[PDB]
Design a protein around this ligand. Sequence first.
Ligand SMILES: Cc1cc2nc3c(=O)[nH]c(=O)nc-3n(C[C@H](O)[C@H](O)[C@H](O)COP(=O)(O)OP(=O)(O)OC[C@H]3O[C@@H](n4cnc5c(N)ncnc54)[C@H](O)[C@@H]3O)c2cc1C
Ligand SMILES: Cc1cc2nc3c(=O)[nH]c(=O)nc-3n(C[C@H](O)[C@H](O)[C@H](O)COP(=O)(O)OP(=O)(O)OC[C@H]3O[C@@H](n4cnc5c(N)ncnc54)[C@H](O)[C@@H]3O)c2cc1C
Ligand SMILES: CC(=O)OC/C=C(\C)CC/C=C(\C)CC[C@H]1OC1(C)C
Ligand SMILES: [Cl-]
Lengths: 472, 472
Amino acid sequence: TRPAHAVVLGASMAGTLAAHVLARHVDAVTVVERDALPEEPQHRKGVPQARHAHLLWSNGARLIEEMLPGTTDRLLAAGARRLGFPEDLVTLTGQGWQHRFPATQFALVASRPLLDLTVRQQALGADNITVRQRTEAVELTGSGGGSGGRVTGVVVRDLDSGRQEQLEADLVIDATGRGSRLKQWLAALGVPALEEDVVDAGVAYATRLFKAPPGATTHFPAVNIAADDRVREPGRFGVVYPIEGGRWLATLSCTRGAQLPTHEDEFIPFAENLNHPILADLLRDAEPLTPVFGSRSGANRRLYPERLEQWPDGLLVIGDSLTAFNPIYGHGMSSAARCATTIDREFERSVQARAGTRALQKAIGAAVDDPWILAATKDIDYVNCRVSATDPRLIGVDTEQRLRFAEAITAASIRSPKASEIVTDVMSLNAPQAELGSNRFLMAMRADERLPELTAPPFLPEELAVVGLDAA
Amino acid sequence: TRPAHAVVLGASMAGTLAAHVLARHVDAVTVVERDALPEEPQHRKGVPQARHAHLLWSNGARLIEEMLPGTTDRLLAAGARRLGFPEDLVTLTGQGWQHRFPATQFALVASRPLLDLTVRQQALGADNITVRQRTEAVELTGSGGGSGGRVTGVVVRDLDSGRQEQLEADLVIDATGRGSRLKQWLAALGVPALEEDVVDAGVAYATRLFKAPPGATTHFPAVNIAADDRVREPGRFGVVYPIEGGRWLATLSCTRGAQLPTHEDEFIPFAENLNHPILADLLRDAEPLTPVFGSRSGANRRLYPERLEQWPDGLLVIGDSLTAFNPIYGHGMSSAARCATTIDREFERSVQARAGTRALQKAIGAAVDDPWILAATKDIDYVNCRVSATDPRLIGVDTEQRLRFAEAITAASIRSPKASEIVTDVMSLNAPQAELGSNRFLMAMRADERLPELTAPPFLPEELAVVGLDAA
Ligand SMILES: Cc1cc2nc3c(=O)[nH]c(=O)nc-3n(C[C@H](O)[C@H](O)[C@H](O)COP(=O)(O)OP(=O)(O)OC[C@H]3O[C@@H](n4cnc5c(N)ncnc54)[C@H](O)[C@@H]3O)c2cc1C
Ligand SMILES: Cc1cc2nc3c(=O)[nH]c(=O)nc-3n(C[C@H](O)[C@H](O)[C@H](O)COP(=O)(O)OP(=O)(O)OC[C@H]3O[C@@H](n4cnc5c(N)ncnc54)[C@H](O)[C@@H]3O)c2cc1C
Ligand SMILES: CC(=O)OC/C=C(\C)CC/C=C(\C)CC[C@H]1OC1(C)C
Ligand SMILES: [Cl-]
């Protein structure tokens, strides 16, 4: 028989999308969220990464727009910018500057709390969605111990007065995030441990927001300094994106072995000593609007509940709980949208005992494969990267065959339009990484023209006039 | 390493589409076809079903259009018709006449040889495709059984010289259709037998081609008398479709226990003994252009190579060879297009592991589930139906509840616009059969208005004037 009540743990991107989707297929859905959610855009305790740069790649954006029509126009009215790639960015790769070919993909950029609010408003207004704020999931209950267990509900605790309630339900959705209490709950029911691939390059972040020169958030590009160097030196990177309200969101990052700015005054010097100091030039006369924010949530991890024979019935794991990625590639929100979309597309087909929630988690795991293999492939080669994985695409691979080809892909994408186009398809999560090994790509990479190398960041003169730096 | 040479066995719809797709991912593609392929739209021995009415549902038409842009316009310029459902059809169901709501789906209708030629012209002109006509696939080469069987190529025989030749290949695609000798080729290699579901209502067809009254193929709807009483009485059905050249293709059908016309003078009386005699009224004075053609290719059957642990590497099976349906629901060509589209989307991901073909075949198997479960569900309850299936959606099911739910779906779709729209999504193969059990459908089915029962076929006066009738 069908699930009549579903409870989703978490009201971040994964849980909000899953709640809306499950509300179409289940009579009642209740969402459990620890924080209070404001109806004006504010940062909150449960989303600590919201202080850092968040790009909603076109894959996630289109999937959210299809589930929740009007969300993008709504975002555009609230001041978000639709950055076209590679056209609206000044990007330095390890092979040189990206030619700003006419945009072949896009990403929506705005403050993460604004996007979360916009999605929550579109998604949680259904009458069969009850949102229980200030409520925490303690552990889950079920008929475990193996032989083919089932999850029956979740222990919740109200946070304004610590009274508890055993939340009983036909299906439980773990969207608690990267720090989620899933593997301890799995232990508490006696189901054996999951298989887990890890590629951890130890990426850490440091973000500050500035007030952009008037008109810069519309008439000036974003700037991204990314030194590809993996196997000789820890990476150090920095990016500045425009957001709503005429403000620049500046995020610095590095890999294990390099050290981040932690004081305000050492921030710009990190931007100063990148391979080009363009970020420091932009940030010297901007109004700082925030302190430094830090994050060390930089590992690629992936659990494979689809591989375990004793995966309990009635339980699903989505979002950062299922698999989390190096944020440098910006796929977590698109991977979350894929999980909900997969649920929407396969729900009725697989609930037709629940021998079908195996198929759901199998479908979900297949939906998150693209952002996993993308991030892990690029991170596996960093010095000081810590790896514990079974993926034959990573481990059964000549490391110098991957490096030489990684460099060649990059060199093509910065100066060949047709290779740039396919590479942005992969980077936007609209084509699998394997497409970069396809006959089609290898043909473009060889047949397409290659423009001369850019000897300076490809700013247009009028763009430097908006931020007042023409001598560059 | 990656496949460099692929051999496609059969050049009907499944093999032509698969060859076109494979030529984009593999250096060389050879197509082996027993028949000579005409450069004019002509019938041929290898596709005898082409004598009968063929509908290309929007699912297949859109997938073909995306693989081969311009195919639809080229079909329409050659005289194909775009039939909107339900608007452009006068249909009698077991619950009454379908209200001709504004079209929510469509199908392209033309003679199958015209559709085949147009597709082959768009698809087989790639320069890395070699088509070996008048050539027969005799057997496969390789080792089978054990921990790792593989197909290495194909023994072919030229039919004009009689000479044989071992065609080596990295990948072999069986697209030889319902009469495919794949199970003997697997036995000859030592592969254990496949699991196979069958739901066989003994469907048969009898078709004649007629000259339509002038203008009827553009200004007169198709007509479909499709009223059953499955569990008490064999089905008897009839359809008249317009095709190119001002012609009507009339296909009568019945299930096991009823008798089809075999002689020309028995054709109109079968149409007369349908629940409404409109088909006989339309055809009585129409000029017949052919004798009666018959077909007994009416079983639903599905092989599950994706379930076989000893499925050999380098082998894929698609099209009617993998799974074939009762043609009354008209999904075989859309299922073929789904197999080719799946190969296009999953190929690169699945070669970068053994030969990658187990993952492809599994993806192919999931893509053919929609037409299988639809056709099998509708046929399973016919009197004298032969059922040999392990599908739990079919076998573990209260049959009076299934008949009771089928009747209710039909009664809703004929008289409620919102129920019609969802049913046409399912019937056009654009939403799974399971959607008819969703909360969305059950609520649409109850909340929507229901128009009055039609007491006569919903022809317009102008349409009855085109064919010279005053009242059905
Ligand atoms: C530095 C950084 C930068 C990133 N940049 C990008 C980017 O540019 N683009 C992009 O697409 N993604 C980006 N990501 C990833 C993205 O932020 C996440 O993948 C996304 O938020 C999806 O996570 P989630 O919703 O599954 O979980 P989370 O966002 O981590 O949310 C978990 C939610 O569950 C709640 N919760 C947790 N435990 C409990 C409990 N026990 N009881 C009740 N409630 C609970 C929390 O309060 C919270 O609301 C970035 C991540 C980081 C760390
Ligand atoms: C009566 C009837 C009506 C139908 N109506 C519809 C409809 O309305 N809509 C729809 O979508 N589908 C319809 N179908 C189904 C549709 O005809 C098939 O699904 C479609 O042709 C795809 O089949 P295929 O390419 O896999 O195989 P086939 O069309 O059967 O082609 C097999 C090909 O392989 C070749 N071949 C066979 N053996 C060998 C060998 N040993 N070596 C080399 N070549 C070989 C044959 O010559 C042929 O070219 C109908 C089918 C029937 C029987
Ligand atoms: C309601 C019900 O009974 O199921 C749905 C099927 C119907 C109504 C048959 C319409 C005929 C169709 C599409 C023709 C298919 C093609 O094979 C021929 C040659 C006839
Ligand atoms: Cl036939």
